[model samples]
Target chain A: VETISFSFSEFEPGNDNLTLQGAALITQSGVLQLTKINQNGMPAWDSTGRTLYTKPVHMWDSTTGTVASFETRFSFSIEQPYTRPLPADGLVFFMGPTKSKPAQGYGYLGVFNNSKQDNSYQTLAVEFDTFSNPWDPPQVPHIGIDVNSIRSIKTQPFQLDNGQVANVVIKYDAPSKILHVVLVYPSSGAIYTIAEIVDVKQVLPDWVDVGLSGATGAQRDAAETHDVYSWSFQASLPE
Target chain B: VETISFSFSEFEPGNDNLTLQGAALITQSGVLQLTKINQNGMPAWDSTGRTLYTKPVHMWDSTTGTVASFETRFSFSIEQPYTRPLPADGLVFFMGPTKSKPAQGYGYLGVFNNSKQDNSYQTLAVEFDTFSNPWDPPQVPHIGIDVNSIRSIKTQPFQLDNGQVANVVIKYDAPSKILHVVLVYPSSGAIYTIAEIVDVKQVLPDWVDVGLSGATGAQRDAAETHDVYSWSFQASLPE
Candidate 1:
């Protein structure tokens, strides 16, 4: 198999390989930190979350019968800047036609644009949710496989500890059309696979944009921080 | 996202989370090293490679529908034990049912048993090779993703330096079924994703061993040595 990869240790929106917009921006240290610790930080939160993608990439020509499989590895963490009764929403990685700029992030987790006026685009995403929303299946501090909707087809809780970063890996199989995701929590290590086989082609286009988005809620005085320490997306065949 | 990390400036083999093995021992000073340069040094390498793993882990369970995922980051170097005409074989990171003692690592890269007529067990591996084999692809001093065989599914040349060690990070997403492996060569710090869609379950059983293996050839009078300066594997749930 042949593959193409794109990665970012630190992000600069509108930079070389990424499509940064919304509240997301590069930090002083070059990290593509999605959420900010300060109320005034880039991708400032107040319900709205941000999304960014690599310049349109072709992993496999979905136009043909050939399905482009991919693998993405990244190190990131959700840190509650200050101890809060509860953490806010979390992050998501997606493969879609466009990076949707959503208005709210608490439950949607920043992948869908719930602007009733603006028809949200379709996409397939995997969410790392920290907070437990009232509507969410009693499983909070979990990861989910999303199919264009807030309710995930696969959702599993994390045995995570306070102040632990997530080491996550995602792989897609073309023929099996299965999408698998795993999360390794640090400090007090706990390994959890949030999803097993949620077909990606079921929601994504043959050729789509790959991106990431994160958000926090408005319920706290101190915010959380999400930094993409390192990221790389690789495909089955050279684009 | 709250994170707590305890870093060791130096490490020890068979410490809190690592498993030590044949010639892959740790020093009293706290360096979880696998191999050495020459017989004249601490590790005393001569026609030998090393393999060390973390004791069997249940970070992910494909069975019971539970999956394990993780993130690992480390720094390592390949140096000339003695000045030779060329650098021999290289190193590899693999996930296997058991840490198999593959014979004849010179060309097999330490993960496979070069013992002829013996069927190599099923496993998944990633190789960072220096010396190009006679029948290998044109890419030299590169990285490759290997399955049961040495012929990697994906391969790319590493833009390496004269005496460079790789800064590697590997993450697996259980939901997406993707294993992403990346390396940043020395100096310029270019990051490359060597593999993306490696399904951990398709090739590996739910509970298995994860480790690092390295080897050097005899072609050079001054053979290259493999050493893992620092390493750690963290799981979400406790060990």
Candidate 2:
């Protein structure tokens, strides 16, 4: 399998390669930062968050009668915005049907638009949440799996050591109906896991876009600076 | 004057903004380095260089029908590859119509493609040359101005004091029909100048695409590594 890596080292505004939506850009310090300022100190609204993606391809394909298997690796950080009290919301890695503009509601993660029929939206997301959601069971800084809605299937509170970045590896097997995720806290050797089996073919589009999304809602006073230090991905049909 | 600046601070492969034709990327060290290398410690045949540019709107344009004047500021470095005995060739600052593949020739400056009708090429370039060309004044390190051909109007020997880096500023007055180029060797108070008056309208297109380019010819070893530390440009049309 061919692995494509992105280690954003340099740039020229409005030029180069990565297509940026919203306020995404590599900072002078060389971090991928997406910021949208508002009078309320929150993301402006609706389409303000960032939806970064790879070339449009079937994130999961089923036409060849072969099950799909894929692995993605990346190191990332969610730095709480300093302008306000603390960071709110967070980033989400998602597999969805093509890239799209962000939804208007809170916690949409820039992946699913504000769809009333939540479960039918067709997005499988792993959210690295920094703030609590009144609707979620573990309403605190945590990580969770979202099948279609921002609502989580399972969640657990986790604290980032000073917002230090963490390493992430996620793998999926279409034939076995398995998803294995690992999040490692480099500073303390703390590891987080979510290994589960589900009918991915039933939850995802035949062809999907793989990417990440971030949001800081208008209802909050703070924002988070999400930076991906490194990212690589590989995918292929099961043998 | 309305100024459009290129800091070269961030980028995504072929996406973000800068239009790149040829081999170019943000190096691991985080500088915009344009290079094409052969296994044999030498750059390939003539005209193998990249042309990076801003959008083709016009580097400097205005409502005044009387031509335009502009100022550009940037710092850059040129280091010879360690594998090679020495560095050959160098970098160029140019204003041309748009991006193009390099013309195969000894002194195309990595900007224009090799042209048989050399002197009539539509562009204005100030070159920091590290090698001497047989057709040039001497085969020594120097700086020169190429109106169209590799042939220069004025030439001077200028050694890089520390190779740490150099600062350059170029200004043009549309109404005066004059162009001024300045180079500063930061370590030594060494300053070079090419104060010449020419009808820019006669040498450059009414609208120009402005950017920098570098080259390493087949004659030399690995060649020089050129990096832009900072760059800014401003311009206004004549009253």
Candidate 3:
């Protein structure tokens, strides 16, 4: 069992301020890195050519070792005006190929769009999408799992009452190729398992690069922050 | 907003060693009664049909006035092999037609099965089924609603963990023809609104009878007690 811890200390409202932090655990075969972030500047691995201006602050490369388990503590700022009327956008986590440098604007390719490329063999993304798009149900932020960078295999809108924390956990078992997602409200001890799938292995590469990204498109005073704290991974050698 | 109470003293265990004690509140027009039972005896209500011998014990039923709320307290004893485990099946509040004589094997229906030719008309039963049945998931029990001799609707099985007191409240809204089932577990501070349905008004007669009944089936050496302490009712029209 290998563990890595990442911490970010700078996240203030109003400013385009974001911090990216991560750690790497050394193993016999390779180095496993865990990254946590909140950034406006996008990195290269984003296959989705969507909005390029706002991007997740975190990213990782497997050149060091095989990628196993990805875990993290995510927190959204609750300062002043944003606290009274919550932020309209949330965050997205990405695992795939890394680009040469940060993309243009926030970075188009950094946005991680599934519609444009044959992300097959190159992408798998979990989105804590906060804004309600035309495709979503009545104005509610949603959580979704995307594969091959094209479609949302699972999506659930979250309606959080005031002052509530939603803890989300996603586990991927490489051997069984299974992915499990769980959402829990710590205050009320109310937990709902949103989705599970056995086809994840078919969509994601065994040792791809990983990253985190966020956005605040053209909306008046539209500001948001995304953060990741820690992560780990375990890989079993093929018999 | 009316209320009443009931209590139980001496309790002895047999095959299934468990006891139950609670009160039923009648929010609609009906007659309410209580009883004591032992040895799988046929209750007074089943006289016309083949009686099934059930647990034998002492019981009492009294109708003070029209009620809107009722309460009761009861306890049981486990005398046989302490190794043989048993579970408390909680208690239920009943409402519907009442006969002068007790039903054959089991004296009267204490919110159990209301499926019989004699129990056909205007009978409504709400059970605090503690044991998980196939119809219910873990810890949840079945709450069935029968009308004009036909079992029309039922609630999903619902229950709290063991060694916990759950406040089971059922309110029949006459004008809307709906029955609301609510369970509050004080220990976990969990409040579950089990069910809410319309059309219940069509099944329940304007003025029916009510009472409490219990048993310890083939799981011999099991003993449990149920009680109804206080009760009250609210009718569509003033009495």
lDDT, candidates in the order shown: 0.63, 0.61, 0.38
Q: Report clashes for each candidate as comma-separated counts.
A: 52, 23, 88
lDDT of 2 by residue, A1-239 (tens): 32233443333355354567765555555555554544554344323445455465454446555556777766777655466655666777777676555554346666666533375678777888876655665545788877887777656566776568777767665654656565666565444555445467778776666766667655545666566665656667543
Error at B94, model 3, angstroms: 26
Better of 1 and 3 by DockQ: 1
lDDT of 1 by residue, A1-239 (tens): 44567767556535667666566767667676776655454333444445455455454555554567788878777766555546667788877774344535656666665523221355777887776765566776778877766667778787546546677778776655656666665454345553355455555655677777787776654246666777878787423
Give the Cα error of residue B24 in candidate 3, in Å: 15
Q: Ranking by lDDT, best first? A: 1, 2, 3
lDDT of predicted model 3: 0.38
Candidate 1 vs candidate 3: the TM-score winner is 1
Cα lDDT of model 1 by residue, B82-200, tens digit? 55466667777777775456545676777776423222356777788877776457666788877777777678787656556667766666656566666765454345554356655
True-vs-predicted CA distance for residue A162, candidate 1, Å: 12
DockQ-based ranking:
1, 3, 2
Off by over 4 Å in 2: A1-17, A36-47, A60-62, A81-86, A114-117, B1-239
lDDT of 2 at A32: 55
DockQ: the better of candidates 2 and 3: 3
- Candidate 1, CAPRI quality class derived from DockQ: incorrect
Q: What is the TM-score of chain B in candidate 3?
A: 0.52
**Cα lDDT tens digits for candidate 2, B137-167:** 7745677777876677666577776346677
TM-score for each model:
0.61, 0.44, 0.37
